[PDB]
Amino acid sequence: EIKELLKLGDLPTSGQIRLYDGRTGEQFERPVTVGYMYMLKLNHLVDDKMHARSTGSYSLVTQQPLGGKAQFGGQRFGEMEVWALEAYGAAYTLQEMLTVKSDDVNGRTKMYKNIVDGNHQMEPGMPESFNVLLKEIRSLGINIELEDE
Amino acid sequence: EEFDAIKIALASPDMIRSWSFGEVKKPETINYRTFKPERDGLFCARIFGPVKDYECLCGKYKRLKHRGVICEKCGVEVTQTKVRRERMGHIELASPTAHIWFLKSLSRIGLLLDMPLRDIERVLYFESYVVIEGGMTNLERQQILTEEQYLDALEEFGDEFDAKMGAEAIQALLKSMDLEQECEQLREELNETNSETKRKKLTKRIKLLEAFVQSGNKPEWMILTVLPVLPPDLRPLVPLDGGRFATSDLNDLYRRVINRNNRLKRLLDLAAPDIIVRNEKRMLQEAVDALLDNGRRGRAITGSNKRPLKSLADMIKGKQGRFRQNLLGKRVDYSGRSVITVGYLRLHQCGLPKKMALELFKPFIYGKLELRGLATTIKAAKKMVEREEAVVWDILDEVIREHPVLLNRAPTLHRLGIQAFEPVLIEGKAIQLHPLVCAAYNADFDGDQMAVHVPLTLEAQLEARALMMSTNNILSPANGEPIIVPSQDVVLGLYYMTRDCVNAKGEGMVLTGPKEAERLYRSGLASLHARVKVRITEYEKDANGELVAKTSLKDTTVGRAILWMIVPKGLPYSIVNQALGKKAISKMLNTCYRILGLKPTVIFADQIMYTGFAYAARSGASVGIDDMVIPEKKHEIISEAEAEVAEIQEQFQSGLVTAGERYNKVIDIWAAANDRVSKAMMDNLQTETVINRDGQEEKQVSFNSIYMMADSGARGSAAQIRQLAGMRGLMAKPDGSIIETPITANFREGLNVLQYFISTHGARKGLADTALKTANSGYLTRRLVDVAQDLVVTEDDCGTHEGIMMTPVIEGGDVKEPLRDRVLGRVTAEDVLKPGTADILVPRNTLLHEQWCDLLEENSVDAVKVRSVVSCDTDFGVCAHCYGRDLARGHIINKGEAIGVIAAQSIGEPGTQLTMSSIQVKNKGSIKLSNVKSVVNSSGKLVITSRNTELKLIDEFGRTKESYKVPYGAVLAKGDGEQVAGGETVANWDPHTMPVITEVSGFVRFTDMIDGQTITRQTDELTGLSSLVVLDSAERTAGGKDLRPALKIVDAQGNDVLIPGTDMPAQYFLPGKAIVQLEDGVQISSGDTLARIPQGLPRVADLFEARRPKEPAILAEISGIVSFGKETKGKRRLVITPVDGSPYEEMIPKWRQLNVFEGERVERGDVISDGPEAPHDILRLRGVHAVTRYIVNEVQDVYRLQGVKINDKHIEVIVRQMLRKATIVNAGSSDFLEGEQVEYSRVKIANRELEANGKVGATYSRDLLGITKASLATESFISAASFQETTRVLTEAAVAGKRDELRGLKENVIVGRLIPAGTGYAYHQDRMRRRAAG
Amino acid sequence: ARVTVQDAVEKIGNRFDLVLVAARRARQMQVGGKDPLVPEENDKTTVIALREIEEGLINNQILDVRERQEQQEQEAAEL
Amino acid sequence: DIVLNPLGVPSRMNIGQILETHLGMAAKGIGDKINAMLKQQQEVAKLREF
Amino acid sequence: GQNMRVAFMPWNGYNFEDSILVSERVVQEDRFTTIHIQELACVSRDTKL
């Protein structure tokens, strides 16, 4: 029936025709199937998924950046990517990704300050997420300390 | 500031009051009219600090005029609000209460007190008394007491004895005990009785007593007397926008516990009846119990929303706890997300949207724009970037340049999921990704997202440029093959243009170079596929690094000549003079890498990418209905198959064939019809092109578009075309069985409703399996990466002894992987020598790169012993030489590289893809029998009388080509060392009948078989040649079952025929199901028989779990004569009688067929019973090399089934990490049989056998644990607590009082320091140098 | 050099040390303000160090002598 | 106005898009002939017959 | 949705892996332009201040 309908419309039976390139303007080696197809515009837009965050809000209990485009949140650096980085051996990238990016209250501020001053120097710090863990374990009834030198 | 270790122990009231800055007494939290916390409440200002920084509650002292004075009006010290996150508080409990962790986790006060948990629970619930002590002999310490007998004791004795109820009773019990007396008593009385059922429990009691003694933990501290409170900000009560409030459940739990504590305090001074005070004390115990762990002891306490309140142990454990959700994995700054689109881009570039770039780098523009002096202040710069003036872009284009940016695609299965690209600014909204890295990312352009991260510091940018750049990542860490292979369009273009046609255009014309070939093709005077003669100048580096040129005239196609302008002056023209499919392109890129280097490789990859895209576009390829040809024999085949379908149905209705045979026949005929259809379709599709050139007709390879994209391997396969055009084979219903009616139709012809419904079963099955089993795959990957944290190369050469043997995989059938690739990249352990004697190629260690592999395969070497990770003698790591060359680079691996993580990632990445009588010689060779007990049968041939013999095929060179298994009591048609060709049935044996063939010849008289007690008289009804029948225990009389019926060999005089050359008597014992063939009086010759005895992803994840198989194969750990003792008491017993050593009695199943008999001799580590082999037994009996080989082979089988290739060194590293614990049999420095890390035993004996001492150290035994047990049993509790069963490991650490040297990668990741890998290794070595010198 | 780091390692002897030495150079190359011995040719601070170790002017053995001569002459000037 | 990869058809096995493409070509061809003969207005009877 | 011409052919790698190559003409005639309605709420409350 498709062949009969194409014959009725003065169209090739095989369903493919020769096209010429728009740039150079010569016929392609082989016939190319061209017809009309019903496309759909899906709800997964690109501007709804576009997002980026340099410095914004921080969570309250754990002092880490929030998540989600709606609240201008940072991307989640999961544990699989931490595994990937430590597989690479990039210890410094990991250190900044764990300390001066999210949970160093006096670390990220001075990293901001010295980046503005054009000095990309690193000043590590103790993550706040570890201090809350220490206080939580200590408040559970079991002593936890740090053996200083 | 800087520290060394983390100390964990129990906390007594002393420093638990020291931490507190006050004591809470009021349940009130915050006022309702104002919102200032009340005095001594849960949010009090004095206890925890001011609500606003540098401001008291009143305001007498503010504005830093006073630094830290305490406002006398209220009592809050003027300071920051950050301190409010660290200030502690305590609650004084009226009655002591029991900690739940040391009560319910298995019991930790039950062991200490020796009393069962049931009695402790009964006492704690105020149900039964316990006698703390008794001055009389009638009562006894630690005796339970009901109320009636308690009153009887009270009226009998009164004050002489002492019993009590409640948690104070447990506290009194813990105070009464003295640890030294138990220490000196239990150890002294342990060695009198070797009762193994109690040896373990008394050993762990001794260990707990030692831990308490030398840990400084007084056991009274286990019972809580004063309870701390968490700082208020960690349990915040913050206002919401709509005037509401939000708080953690910890506020609820604290309010409950302090309300009940105050009520108890009030009740005590009221002299309330004892039942009400007991009820209140029990309520306090339950409230504190719920606070520490809600749903652990009783019913979980729910809030106003009917959901259980989470305790403060619920929020440090599990998936949602601080460890996994906030410490290991962390939200990050300077990051973005966008959809992924295709790139013309270079391999080291990514298309970054300009709109995202200004946001990501915003501080960088601020700083650069201040430096340029364009805006006076930073706020002015913020205004400029908010207006998006031209200057901000003029700053951006040079801010980003030479500043690499990471790209992440979740899930990051392996190390390649994170790569660094040099940004290029694009007008748009989507991330442009280079197509060559899509395969590594496992990303398609169907809506997938991408996470972008920008490194900040110089060290981070340098690391991204040096290690993370996509140019550096060429070969996968799993194995040496490249990972930038062109996927689908490039290969299609190259395959299309490296073709030939018989009479295309300008054929046979001779050209002077590839340049005029390209000009000819562009001008249209010559076709792209035309056999032409082209003068081609290729280069070769036969010289010592110098390139020599040879000019020759070759016949080829125009497209192949055009390719030659891309090859980088180091490769032969023969590499382009073929069809150039996917495999060809991959191998040609690999050769370009191995011969030239890295920069030519990346330039070449980019150039062939560009050419493939351009010529695929120039070609024009489409899929149409006419492209799917249909054989004219399809309907004929279908009708011919239905003919025998109908005939088989009529045979079934006749009744001469049952259901099973009919099923098998119809399945077979349908499969044959399907194969015929597929053959016809392939025949019509592969050479359908019939064309003529100056002749009659000539048939060439088809130019059909679908065949073009199937042959080149761009997309699809020959198996997809079968169901694209021919029938859609057979499918199975969910139960597993296969539907007999096939899908005779295809997708070109469409499907019936029934056929579609049938196919939907399989579609749904596969989709559900894919959606399900990759969760288990991810869990397995996490478990694997947990144990292999600490594997970092530390030395270059540990100087160890011999390593492990290496052999090809010739066993089973044809060779799968030869010795060429199983040893490529290894290091030898001895002076391995060529087949010619005294021809040595290695001085005990060398890198087996390609040249050495070629030299080895040129010789006839088949066994090489290489250095392995498991054999490495390095303490706390491995040495580089015991590992081998890196696979991502090809050179010897350098120190500091974390090998465990890459190993776990590499063997966990393919987890998703792996969701699911006679012997005939095949090739010419030498029939070789290894470990054979040869004997001659009655026909003069060679027969076998052992099970440890294997059939080997030895070629003219000497190396073994084929291996086969021959069972005991088989018949061979050929002798040993026979030069024969393939296609001959050499070995024959009955798969059901198992013979007891006698090795010697002599008279056979029936001895020790008395009828009516052990045997039954049964005669064959057709042949008449029959003898007495021996049955098993369940079928024979128990009267004669005491002695096994033995049929010894005698002579005319009546004496035993001994073994030729040995004085041991030769007699045969008859087990059950043994019917003697020959009669009495007649005899047999050598080799003749006396009696005839008739006979996935979890599949690999269980290997690392060290799961015990359901029916393990029981072996023997010592040689000697095997015998049997006790019979038919639950299960048969076995006796081992070695020549001089001891007796061995163990347990064997009599319902399982054995390998040896009463009169046979077996050796250590031999198979007596059949079944799967347990890895623990393999380690126990044979060496660690054997278990490593077994695990490696069994794992590699699963991957070879799915066609996934992984280097073997990635399995044996994890196996090495499995074998870290040891058990001690001797003594001298430790307990009698305590478990201990093997390296600790090595460093213990490193001086007891050195000059420091003659001999005191104890000998050990290797111990294998499962992957999870190995992960939890680590010297560092921080690594274990962040994995699984956090409560248990924290309780063990608390009681034992352990400390961590912070050696592992995960521990430093949690703390936030440099990981000890790569650069962090160079930092930690300096730290160790500083610490060593003080 | 600029896209690949192949010839740096032979001058260095290791890969994990090249990042350390390059960062150590770029520190006082950027904040110290001292003129790089390799030319500029419109490059960034983190890549001119890579080019310098490509042509291998500096080494860790010689990276610790010019910084002690300067301080010793400083103290000579003070005293 | 849309260019699609031919390689996405066989491995993915969604052949219905090719048949839909052929139907679309046929339907638009019929529409083009109708529109071409309508622009000239030959006869109402001729349009009815076609 | 809408229906328009479609060609099955690899174009310079711009439809490399399920990507779509689209026209400027289809943008000119707004064959896929869509309207989105958003609601924004401003609330005035009586704070104690």
From Swiss-Prot, chain B:
Changing G766 to A/C: Resistant to antibiotics salinamide A and B. Changing A763 to T/V: Resistant to antibiotics salinamide A and B. Changing M681V: Resistant to antibiotics salinamide A and B. Gene3D superfamilies: 1.10.132.30, 1.10.150.390, 1.10.1790.20, 1.10.40.90, 2.40.40.20, 2.40.50.100, RNA polymerase II, clamp domain, RNA polymerase Rpb1, domain 3. The keyword Transferase applies. Its EC number is 2.7.7.6. Keywords: Acetylation, Antibiotic resistance, DNA-directed RNA polymerase, Magnesium, Metal-binding, Nucleotidyltransferase, Transcription, Transferase, Zinc. SUPFAM superfamilies: beta and beta-prime subunits of DNA dependent RNA-polymerase. Binds 1 Mg(2+) ion per subunit. Its cofactor is Mg(2+); Zn(2+). The modification N6-acetyllysine is found at K952. Changing R764C: Resistant to antibiotics salinamide A and B. It holds the Pfam family RNA_pol_Rpb1_5. Belongs to the RNA polymerase beta' chain family. The RNAP catalytic core consists of 2 alpha, 1 beta, 1 beta' and 1 omega subunit. When a sigma factor is associated with the core the holoenzyme is formed, which can initiate transcription. The rRNA transcription and antitermination complex (rrnTAC) consists of RNAP, NusA, NusB, NusE (rpsJ), NusG, SubB, ribosomal protein S4, DNA and precursor rRNA; S4 is more flexible than other subunits. DNA-dependent RNA polymerase (RNAP) catalyzes the transcription of DNA into RNA using the four ribonucleoside triphosphates as substrates. This is DNA-directed RNA polymerase subunit beta'. It comes from Escherichia coli (strain K12). The gene is rpoC.
Curated annotation (Swiss-Prot), chain C:
It catalyses: RNA(n) + a ribonucleoside 5'-triphosphate = RNA(n+1) + diphosphate. GO terms for molecular function: bacterial-type RNA polymerase core enzyme binding; DNA binding; DNA-directed RNA polymerase activity. GO terms for cellular component: cytosol; cytosolic DNA-directed RNA polymerase complex; RNA polymerase complex; transcription elongation factor complex. Gene3D superfamilies: 3.90.940.10. Disulfide bonds: none annotated. Keywords: DNA-directed RNA polymerase, Nucleotidyltransferase, Transcription, Transferase. GO terms for biological process: bacterial-type flagellum assembly; bacterial-type flagellum-dependent cell motility; cell motility; cellular response to cell envelope stress; DNA-templated transcription initiation; intracellular iron ion homeostasis; nitrate assimilation; protein-containing complex assembly. Promotes RNA polymerase (RNAP) assembly. Latches the N- and C-terminal regions of the beta' subunit thereby facilitating its interaction with the beta and alpha subunits. The RNAP catalytic core consists of 2 alpha, 1 beta, 1 beta' and 1 omega subunit. When a sigma factor is associated with the core the holoenzyme is formed, which can initiate transcription. The rRNA transcription and antitermination complex (rrnTAC) consists of RNAP, NusA, NusB, NusE (rpsJ), NusG, SubB, ribosomal protein S4, DNA and precursor rRNA; S4 is more flexible than other subunits. It comes from Escherichia coli (strain K12).
Curated annotation (Swiss-Prot), chain D:
It comes from the Bacteria. Acetylated on several lysine residues in the presence of glucose. Co-administration of salinamide and rifampicin or salinamide and myxopyronin suppresses the emergence of resistance to both antibiotics. Disulfide bonds: none annotated. The RNAP catalytic core consists of 2 alpha, 1 beta, 1 beta' and 1 omega subunit. When a sigma factor is associated with the core the holoenzyme is formed, which can initiate transcription. The rRNA transcription and antitermination complex (rrnTAC) consists of RNAP, NusA, NusB, NusE (rpsJ), NusG, SubB, ribosomal protein S4, DNA and precursor rRNA; S4 is more flexible than other subunits. In pull-down experiments interacts with CedA. (Microbial infection) Interacts (via flap domain) with Escherichia phage lambda antitermination protein Q; this interaction renders bacterial RNAP resistant to transcription pausing and allows it to read through termination signals. Belongs to the RNA polymerase beta chain family. DNA-dependent RNA polymerase (RNAP) catalyzes the transcription of DNA into RNA using the four ribonucleoside triphosphates as substrates. Resistance to the antibiotics salinamide A, salinamide B, rifampicin, streptolydigin, CBR703, myxopyronin, and lipiarmycin can result from mutations in this protein.
Swiss-Prot record, chain E:
Co-administration of salinamide and rifampicin or salinamide and myxopyronin suppresses the emergence of resistance to both antibiotics. The lineage of its organism: Bacteria, Pseudomonadati, Pseudomonadota, Gammaproteobacteria, Enterobacterales. Acetylated on several lysine residues in the presence of glucose. Belongs to the RNA polymerase beta chain family. DNA-dependent RNA polymerase (RNAP) catalyzes the transcription of DNA into RNA using the four ribonucleoside triphosphates as substrates. Resistance to the antibiotics salinamide A, salinamide B, rifampicin, streptolydigin, CBR703, myxopyronin, and lipiarmycin can result from mutations in this protein. Disulfide bonds: none annotated. Changing E17K: Disrupts the enzyme's active center. The RNAP catalytic core consists of 2 alpha, 1 beta, 1 beta' and 1 omega subunit. When a sigma factor is associated with the core the holoenzyme is formed, which can initiate transcription. The rRNA transcription and antitermination complex (rrnTAC) consists of RNAP, NusA, NusB, NusE (rpsJ), NusG, SubB, ribosomal protein S4, DNA and precursor rRNA; S4 is more flexible than other subunits. In pull-down experiments interacts with CedA. Signal peptide: none annotated. This is DNA-directed RNA polymerase subunit beta.
